[PDB]
């Protein structure tokens, strides 16, 4: 059919317009590969992971390439199989890097972002002051939901005794939950469209720029919710997705030292408190205990999503605050600023620069040893090409010996190949220029004098970095765009 074409089209990493939205509990379950039910990580004796823990082969794929956990399936015969002793599936261990898990929170829990990001999405959706919402989340005070046939507004909040005498009046036809469960009931029972029309009319009529401003803000958020199609009740977590264990690794160091990522500790306290909440709910505990447990579970989930917007849970035994998911995406040194941009680059070296004033404007002196390292794969190719080496492994041995032939080959692969030179604080675009290298003894990069002012360079210890453009397009860009002999006028 054409559905095969639809599928092979979905099997294509070529896309456009990445989207973003809230995650329903069902969607979060859909991402998952299984539920995490235990705070265990590895086995302290044979370090293979536990079953259903933060590192679980059955949930997050195997540890060793193409073999189950219980070693029963190693052979190449079984390569898609699911072992039965350990529920592991025999695939490549890189899947340990993409499968997510999930935790089933025993009680709903507010997503801190949509609560404590300063225009409180929850608040201005419910039109409830953040102070009173927090009053409700910490079980300080009830909140009416569907007062019914009584003198109770839909969001009028009561303290304990007020709700008491309320019950004494009407034991029913009136509902007042407490805690994130209540907030979820409110968010769910709302009507975006009815309230949208109502607020639209109210905005039409009343004339007081504070009220009209708040009103257009709220009507903006409401129409936004009805356009995006995201349910507001999703701003309250019920399933909590857990990160692939390969991204919060528990790598071992030499000598029993284990290095771990804080997310393991944050996840672990979430799971512990969740399990204890389940156990309490079963034991039918005094309501004060269960409330305290729900409170501290909410606290753990907040610490996990954004540690710091509260009492700032620091790590055990180390007097540093833990680092949460927010702290990983957000941050100048955080990923999205350190990752996805400003990346560490291969085929690149660094060294001290000197003058070498015998060069032509398009040349740079490149130390022989540096070049022999930067271009090593070009040299492997060229050696195998001229037969001087039977195999790439032989060629590796050759360039390690530095046989006098690799120097000729090196002078050959360098011939027209321009390299990029970049000085440390690249202020403007002349901070990166392409040069053609002249193989040079010693260990200093020899830089033409006339370009120094461009780099704002001094020969008083400053170092420059060299990069090697690889593809043909890159070499042609370097020669045509970034060659030194093209940047004679400044673009300022």
């Amino acid at each position: 059919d054409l559905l095969k074409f639809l599928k092979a089209q979905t099997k294509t990493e070529e896309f456009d317009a990445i989207k973003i939205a809230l995650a329903s509990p069902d969607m979060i379950r859909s991402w998952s590969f299984g539920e995490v039910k235990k705070p265990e990580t590895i086995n302290y004796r044979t370090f293979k992971p536990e079953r259903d823990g933060l590192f679980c082969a059955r949930i997050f794929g195997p540890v060793k390439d193409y073999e189950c956990l219980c070693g029963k399936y190693k052979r190449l015969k079984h390569r898609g199989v699911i072992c039965e002793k350990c529920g592991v599936e025999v695939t490549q261990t890189k899947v340990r890097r993409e499968r997510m898990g999930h935790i089933e929170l025993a009680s709903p829990t507010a997503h801190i972002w949509f609560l404590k990001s300063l225009p409180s999405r929850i608040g201005l959706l419910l039109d409830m002051p953040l102070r009173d919402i927090e009053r409700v989340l910490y079980f300080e005070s009830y909140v009416v939901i569907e007062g019914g046939m009584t003198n109770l507004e839909r969001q009028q909040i009561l303290t304990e005794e007020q709700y008491l005498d309320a019950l004494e009046e009407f034991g029913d036809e009136f509902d007042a939950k407490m805690g994130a469960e209540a907030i979820q009931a409110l968010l769910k029972s709302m009507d975006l469209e009815q309230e949208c029309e109502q607020l639209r009319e109210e905005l039409n009529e009343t004339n007081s720029e504070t009220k009209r401003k708040k009103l257009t803000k709220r009507i903006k958020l409401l129409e936004a919710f009805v356009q995006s199609g995201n349910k507001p009740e999703w701003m309250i977590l019920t399933v909590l997705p857990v990160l692939p264990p390969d991204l919060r690794p528990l790598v071992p160091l030499d000598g029993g030292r284990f290095a771990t990522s804080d997310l393991n500790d944050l996840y672990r306290r979430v799971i512990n408190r969740n399990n204890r909440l389940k156990r309490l709910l079963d034991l039918a505990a005094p309501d004060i205990i269960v409330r305290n447990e729900k409170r501290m579970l909410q606290e753990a989930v907040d610490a996990l999503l954004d540690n710091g917007r509260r009492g700032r849970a620091i790590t055990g035994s180390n007097k540093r605050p833990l680092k949460s998911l927010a702290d990983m995406i957000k941050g100048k040194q955080g990923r999205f600023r350190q990752n996805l941009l400003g990346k560490r680059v291969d085929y690149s070296g660094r060294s001290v620069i000197t003058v070498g004033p015998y060069l032509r404007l398009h040349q740079c002196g490149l130390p022989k040893k540096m070049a022999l390292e930067l271009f090593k794969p070009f040299i492997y190719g060229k050696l195998e090409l001229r037969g001087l080496a039977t195999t790439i492994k032989a060629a590796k041995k050759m360039v390690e010996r530095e046989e006098a032939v690799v120097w000729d080959i090196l002078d050959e692969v360098i011939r027209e190949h321009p390299v990029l030179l970049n000085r440390a604080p690249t202020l403007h675009r002349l901070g990166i220029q392409a040069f053609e290298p002249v193989l040079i003894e010693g260990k200093a990069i020899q830089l033409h004098p006339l370009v120094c002012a461009a780099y704002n360079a001094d020969f008083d210890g400053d170092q420059m970095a060299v990069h090697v453009p690889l593809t043909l397009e890159a070499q042609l860009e370097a020669r045509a765009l970034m060659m030194s002999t093209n940047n004679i006028l400044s673009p300022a």
Binding site: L427, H428, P491
Partner: protein, 44 residues
């Protein structure tokens, strides 16, 4: 008048090169760099 960009005629020419600017040239970046590249040599 352009939407999402500027016309090569409204912009001008000034460049390393000397002719009118070429389509697809990223002027915003080189502008940010020309304005901020000084500065960290003369405050006042």
């Amino acid at each position: 008048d352009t939407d999402f960009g500027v016309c090569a005629h409204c912009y001008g020419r000034d460049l390393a090169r000397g002719h009118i600017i070429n389509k697809g040239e990223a002027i915003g970046v080189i502008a940010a760099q020309s304005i901020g590249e000084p500065g960290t040599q003369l405050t006042m």
